[PDB]
Design a protein around this ligand. Structure first.
Ligand SMILES: CCC(=O)N1CCC[C@H](n2c(=O)c(-c3cccc(F)c3Cl)c(C)c3cnc(Nc4ccc(N5CCN(C)CC5)c(C)c4)nc32)C1
Length: 283
């Protein structure tokens, strides 16, 4: 029923990349800020290098199969004694931290454009018949403040406060259950990083949603924006919007940003000669 997955998985020599600095230490892995120089190609590509296995290779398998401006991509892997994944560096970190750090300087144009790009990347995953199951502001990376990407397909094929009701109850996951988390994600951005249902036990979340309660309208949010969030959180999943509609809706609003989001002050907010961004390095 499926078409053959003709993705290419690139194996890289460890002498082809050098690790400059550390970005994260996690029980699963440690990740390095680094640089990748394909052999005799006279390019240096800024990369994130992950060191730790059926998990890490499943992750690599998925990332090698996606090609989209708003989805993270795998550049290659190294079958070193400790297996290494080589991915594109996202200099500004994850969007959740970004939004918390710079709230006093984030305008409505930026917020709405991010909603467009995540909708684009998620619509792409739907095209690829792929289901993310962990979309959240913590899993959107920032390449430039103008360009974000969806990341962390650890669960692609547990975060209850981002989860659709069907998912909490029956462990069902859909593109439409992804739309729910898109709404929760949008809510994280419009509240500038607040935690959803803060100070609530996860065990209660299922009953609360069944009662008809949801997350509050963020102060900067016109009802136009909040209506879109609310529709992403309907019980009936064929009632929620399609990602392709979310693209259209947020794109309309991104034309007149100030009409949809009201933000105080919103109006006015050694050798690197051969470095190329991975987005322009093609094979
Ligand atoms: C959720 C964010 C998160 O905390 N961490 C843990 C460490 C990096 C991790 N991280 C990946 O896991 C992955 C990834 C995803 C899937 C598979 C795979 F092999 C990989 Cl490598 C990628 C692509 C990645 C790309 N760019 C980047 N830039 C980046 C990260 C952190 C920072 N900091 C450090 C300084 N300040 C203390 C705060 C902010 C900065 C400035 C840039 N970080 C990436 C994810």
């Amino acid at each position: 029923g499926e078409a053959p997955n003709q993705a290419l998985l690139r194996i890289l020599k460890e002498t082809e990349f050098k690790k400059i600095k550390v970005l994260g230490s996690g029980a699963f892995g440690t990740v390095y800020k680094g640089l990748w120089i394909p052999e005799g190609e006279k390019v240096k590509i800024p990369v994130a290098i992950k060191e730790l296995n059926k998990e890490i290779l499943d992750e690599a398998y998925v990332m090698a199969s996606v090609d989209n401006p708003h989805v993270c991509r795998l550049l290659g892997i190294c079958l070193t004694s400790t297996v290494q994944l080589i991915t594109q560096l996202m200099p500004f970190g994850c969007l959740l931290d970004y939004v918390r750090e710079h709230k006093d300087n984030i305008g409505s144009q930026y917020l709405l454009n991010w909603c467009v790009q995540i909708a684009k990347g998620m619509n792409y995953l739907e095209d690829r018949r792929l289901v993310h199951r962990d979309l959240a502001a913590r899993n959107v990376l920032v390449k430039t403040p103008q360009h974000v990407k969806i990341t962390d397909f650890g669960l692609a094929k547990v975060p209850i406060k981002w989860m659709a009701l069907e998912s909490i109850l029956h462990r069902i996951y859909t593109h439409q259950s992804d739309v729910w988390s898109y709404g929760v994600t949008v809510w994280e951005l419009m509240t500038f990083g607040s935690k959803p249902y803060d100070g609530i036990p996860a065990s209660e979340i299922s009953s609360i949603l069944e009662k008809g309660e949801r997350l509050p309208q963020p102060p900067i949010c016109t009802i136009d924006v909040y209506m879109i969030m609310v529709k992403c959180w309907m019980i009936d999943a064929d009632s929620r919007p399609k990602f392709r509609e979310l693209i259209i809706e947020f794109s309309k609003m991104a034309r007149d940003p100030q009409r949809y989001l009201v933000i105080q002050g919103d109006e006015r907010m050694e050798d690197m000669d051969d470095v190329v961004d991975a987005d322009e390095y093609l094979i």
